[PDB]
Amino acid sequence: KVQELSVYEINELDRHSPKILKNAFSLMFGLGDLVPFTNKLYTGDLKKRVGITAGLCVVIEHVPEKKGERFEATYSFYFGDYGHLSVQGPYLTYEDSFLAITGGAGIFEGAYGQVKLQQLVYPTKLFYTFYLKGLANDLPLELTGTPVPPSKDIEPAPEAKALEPSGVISNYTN
Amino acid sequence: KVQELSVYEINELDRHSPKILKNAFSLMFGLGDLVPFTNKLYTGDLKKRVGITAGLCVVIEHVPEKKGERFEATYSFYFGDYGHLSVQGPYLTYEDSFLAITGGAGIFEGAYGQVKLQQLVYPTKLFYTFYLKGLANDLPLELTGTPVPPSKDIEPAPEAKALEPSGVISNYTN
Amino acid sequence: KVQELSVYEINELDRHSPKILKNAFSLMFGLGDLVPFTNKLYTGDLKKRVGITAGLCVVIEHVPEKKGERFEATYSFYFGDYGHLSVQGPYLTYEDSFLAITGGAGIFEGAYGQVKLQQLVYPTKLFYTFYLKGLANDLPLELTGTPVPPSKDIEPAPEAKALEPSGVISNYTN
């Protein structure tokens, strides 16, 4: 059985991220370029800060026909004391994609399946829907509030941005 | 339970790959050297272009007694409209290895198991057999044609090299 | 069914590891810094050399309040002819963590679950406890001996450090 889990990834530009290592044959992004990154992670309902994303985008090619890039991404999603989910697969700056769920820890131990990545605002706002299989238990309620429908205009709740107790999960990852 | 899927990975020298990021203090490959790469991917029967490989080889050590290198590889295999498979493990230029199937997406959602990598012609031709478990359905027939036995002089079908509809899968990855 | 497996990872300073690829604009570790690494791997009881670890640590942030770093790690554990385990997740220099088991090969084909990482000496001695699901068979007895109590003072058996037949597994990874 699938448990859907949605999250918002936001680059608030206060984590030194992205760091672009530019090595390619080309002026534009190309093979050789590496982009270590880490962004903030909020619940799908945008009410709470949960943690961070962390990992590496490997540039594969520039896609001039689509005015964008293909990356191959290896990274994790951190949910404070709940644990983390890890993923591998395509990040395309110009369209939605699906990544493999490579595993998890904590409540996410045994996780498998795929996750849909939707870019909302390039490069600062992304929305994910994990189609989670293999979990030992029902996901905690504070993570499964009805998601805010994805649009360019979404914002984390002000109390979550401000890191107030009501706007964070316990020991949210930073 | 297990569905065998074989593919040929071929470097046709037209994707700027591999890109060597040199950091080891050695004329040979060494720890510190990073190799982002992307090659073309064909069906096991060599009749169709399916997509590409994409990811990163991390050099671990030069192995002089084996006249080759040990890499640690993290990458994906793209199958056009069907989805992708992701892997992690040893790439040894000097001998066959098995990598872990970390997951998949699309028709490969839920994939697990191991994949045999056969070093056919260094570095331009590699042959893989995925021992796929966890798939929802039987693989599409166009992916499971009897593989061409691996040998040094294998070549994709001319229709596949030329990207004719008869020689590609739909939305083959490029 | 869960099988527990513990191993010690030791940097014996003879594998050119770690290699620091410095890209952050600070004397301290920061986003942009990449650390390819490979250490030796011994049984939990420290009687036998089994192989190596191999992969990449991506620096995510310096954590000044904890006098340490957060890495995001992608790597494998090699057990000679037995195969390997692959992992994805957090390495925090200042506290224990859990990483996701992304898959395996050989006797570890089908492996999933999570692994505890405990740092004993930064960066030269670490102790792991894998909580392994999905294995086809019981772990071999030579891998499941009672672990030596974890501390800063642990050392491999002299036969294992010296690579004597009684102190190594069959075709231990090097």
From Swiss-Prot, chains A, B, C:
Note: The four allene oxide cyclase proteins (AOC1, AOC2, AOC3 and AOC4) are encoded by duplicated genes. They are very similar, and most experiments involving antibodies do not discriminate between the different members.
Alphabetized UniProt keyword annotations: Chloroplast, Isomerase, Plastid, Transit peptide
Any one annotated GO CC term: chloroplast stroma
First-listed, main subcellular location of the protein, grouped into a coarse class: plastid
Expression sites by tissue: Highly expressed in fully developed leaves.
Upregulation: High local and systemic induction by wounding.
Example GO molecular function: allene-oxide cyclase activity
Location in the cell: Plastid, Chloroplast
Species of origin: Arabidopsis thaliana
Enzymatic reactions: (9Z,13S,15Z)-12,13-epoxyoctadeca-9,11,15-trienoate = (9S,13S,15Z)-12-oxophyto-10,15-dienoate
Residues of the full protein shown: 80 to 253 of 253
Role, per record: Involved in the production of 12-oxo-phytodienoic acid (OPDA), a precursor of jasmonic acid.
Family membership: Belongs to the allene oxide cyclase family.
Single Gene Ontology BP annotation: jasmonic acid biosynthetic process
Protein name: Allene oxide cyclase 2, chloroplastic
Underlying gene: AOC2
EC number(s) recorded for this UniProt protein: 5.3.99.6
Superkingdom of the organism of origin: Eukaryota
